Design a protein around this ligand. Sequence first.
Ligand SMILES: [Zn+2]
Ligand SMILES: [Zn+2]
Ligand SMILES: [Zn+2]
Lengths: 55, 328, 111, 111
Amino acid sequence: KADRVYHQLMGHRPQLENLLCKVNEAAPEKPQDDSGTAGGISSTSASVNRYILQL
Amino acid sequence: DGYYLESDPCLVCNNPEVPFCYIKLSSIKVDTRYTTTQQVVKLIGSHTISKVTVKIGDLKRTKMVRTINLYYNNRTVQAIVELKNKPARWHKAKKVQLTPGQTEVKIDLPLPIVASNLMIEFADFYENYQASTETLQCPRCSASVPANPGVCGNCGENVYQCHKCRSINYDEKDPFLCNACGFCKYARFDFMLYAKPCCAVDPIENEEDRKKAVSNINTLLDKADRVYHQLMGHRPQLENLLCKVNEAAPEKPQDDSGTAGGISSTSASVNRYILQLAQEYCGDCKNSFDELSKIIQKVFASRKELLEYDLQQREAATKVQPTFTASQ
Amino acid sequence: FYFLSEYLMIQQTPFVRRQVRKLLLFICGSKEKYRQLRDLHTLDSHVRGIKKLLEEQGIFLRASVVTASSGSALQYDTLISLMEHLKACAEIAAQRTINWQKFCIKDDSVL
Amino acid sequence: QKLITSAHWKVYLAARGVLPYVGNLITKEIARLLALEEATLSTDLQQGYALKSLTGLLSSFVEVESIKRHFKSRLVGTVLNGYLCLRKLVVQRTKLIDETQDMLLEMLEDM
Ligand SMILES: [Zn+2]
Ligand SMILES: [Zn+2]
Ligand SMILES: [Zn+2]
């Protein structure tokens, strides 16, 4: 069970790295409208970069 | 999206191309009065209107609309009753003719109108004449009632009362609209305005309005000064939040006893300085900047109207170029 | 041809126009030509209407140059009539383009 | 204003010629507003902060009797010109401009 959870944690590692790169770019991710049934994240909170949000 | 902390907001970045939209008239009415043929409405604010669509439901063949007149003005009034019986205060936008039994009317305006008030007039009818001589039936007790005076001899009910509000019209026994509540027994009318929420100021007539307009401009300028202070008042706090985030300190999420605020685990995870900055700028600075931009646009409209009035007066007092687009 | 086109232009004639239309296209001999003459007259009439409407308001066409003796802005109803005529011309030009092009090569000022 | 709160240093600066300098600055600012008055209708929230502050400085200097005595004849012209040019403002007239015009009126009446 431990090898499996370790792999899960190490499996999230790459995702963290990519999200960090996209944050490192410091690109202005102007809030994108929720075309699909995305969560009505409060505007005050939605403000935080979606890159930072996912991270 | 926008830079909310900007002095003398750009008339380009801030001012967008407001789009026209199929707004239900019912959603933007704040006051309504009626005559027997007119619906007179105050809007929640000034709107630029390009089209009006009229839908007609529950149509009765006994009396059908033949002519609709659309009127407007951009006068600021406290209550629409001030304009109800004042025909000289209305501008005619369009006259349209209907065929018998037509259930939809599209009124395309040749130029958009700026209006804070509308008047829709049912001006002519394809009335189908019937035998009104026949004794009417009492709506309460079904007894026969003579058409004159139209009062039931058994229960005292008036057969000409409005079915909706029970008001009686003294001058017209069979009005197209109830002058008290706008009820029409001949049809139901829905109005869809292809317009946009573009605020504007009332026209100026004489010094009464010119001095009044200048006072309004001064008040709005004082308001902008106040909202300016609020917007720039956040600037220092925003700079503080920026410095704090730049420190990039590992401040572990603090479990505040007060959990009334809807703080999600992810949000709690997000840096509080980051969260404080997001609330201060995207929330507070953006609200203050939106208020200031609205006030600035209204002030610009008042100045522009004042400028035009002054030019007209001088134009007459005096008694230009092909590239006149440069001017005005 | 001009008289028959003016009879068509008469809205007071909703049935007489139909008879005049048949006579006008008959005198023309070709529907294509008939439409060309009718469109040219309609555009010319709307153009002179705009010209005189701006003359009376104060926008004067002097040597194909617009002069505005009066400044400020134009009346809303003047813009309404202007838009009626210009929408008529736009309908003519978009529905039938060649007519408009030749009318404006005939009257350069218009352009 | 804190450094010159004493009439001692106000008189010293007046001797050096600060009053003509501030008068010329007020005149230049009012001329710039006039120049903008006939230009685009650019609304400014602080429009007139420099003008109001310069007029406040001039009023603070005038609030000393000796400087008033020695500079009434030299300041009357610039105060008259400034007040007259400020009265021309209609579209760009800001609350701060109104306060400046009131201060200039008070200074003129005092002069
Ligand atoms: Zn801008
Ligand atoms: Zn009865
Ligand atoms: Zn009623």
